[PDB]
Design a binder for this molecule. Structure first.
Ligand SMILES: C[C@H](S)C(=O)NCC(=O)O
Ligand SMILES: [Zn+2]
Ligand SMILES: [Zn+2]
Length: 236
């Protein structure tokens, strides 16, 4: 079902295409106590296979994503990468595993997952001192370039860039350019957030479209605005 802003709504989910081979999947959870909070992930068509970034809030919603891919793209999903251990990102792991999809996550995310009430991914990504993922730990990721910017939204948020496009996924590290706060600061590293935000921008300097978890895709203005807000917080 197409809407005003060019977003196709598919059941309780919403899908928007960002590039010839990149879609953004959006799911909603009526959050206690807040309201209906949106969460964004990515779907990437890489040849004869599909790559998924982040699940939905629930197993059923993630299964709905899988149905959409089967219906709209019709290609086997090779792998999934989840960006950190919160429900909006890892709430539908069982749906992926029941579908036989190999799942990947930061080793710290997999370690933190039980405490965060999550199901861990099946494989662990580790990272070099400069932030880039060990290539041996992220095999055949195609156009996906995974980067750990340091502690920000959580101690474990990783970010993904997509080769061939100008799209980088900041996840819940980056907020939009009109955000007046940084949101859920429960697991946040207020001391290193700003550094992490700028590190992300430096990792993908040629990315002009920044996709984030809870807002529509923004420009690089979101990165500098986030880091600026993170500075204000750190300076008390
Ligand atoms: C404000 C934060 S980033 C949110 O929307 N959800 C946090 C969570 O999924 O646990
Ligand atoms: Zn989170
Ligand atoms: Zn979140």
């Amino acid at each position: 079902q197409q809407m005003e802003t060019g977003d196709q709504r598919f059941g309780d989910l919403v899908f928007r295409q960002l590039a010839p081979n990149v879609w953004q999947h959006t799911s909603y959870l009526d959050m206690p106590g807040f309201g209906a909070v949106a969460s964004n992930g990515l779907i990437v068509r890489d040849g004869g296979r599909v790559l998924v970034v982040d699940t939905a809030w629930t197993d059923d919603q993630t299964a709905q994503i899988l149905n959409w891919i089967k219906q709209e793209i019709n290609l086997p999903v090779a792998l999934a990468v989840v960006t950190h251990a919160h429900q909006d990102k890892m709430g539908g792991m069982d749906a992926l595993h029941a579908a036989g999809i190999a799942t990947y996550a930061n080793a710290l995310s997999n370690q933190l997952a039980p405490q965060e009430g999550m199901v861990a991914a099946q494989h662990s990504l580790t990272f070099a001192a400069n932030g880039w993922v060990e290539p041996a730990t992220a095999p055949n990721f195609g156009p996906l370039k995974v980067f750990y910017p340091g502690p920000g939204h959580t101690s474990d948020n990783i970010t993904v860039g997509i080769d061939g496009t100008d799209i980088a996924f900041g996840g819940c590290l980056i907020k939009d350019s009109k955000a007046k706060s940084l949101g859920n600061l429960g697991d946040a590293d207020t001391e290193h957030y700003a550094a992490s935000a700028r590190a992300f921008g430096a990792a993908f300097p040629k990315a002009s479209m920044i996709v984030m978890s809870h807002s529509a895709p923004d420009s690089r203005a979101a990165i500098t605005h986030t880091a600026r807000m993170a500075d204000k917080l750190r300076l008390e």
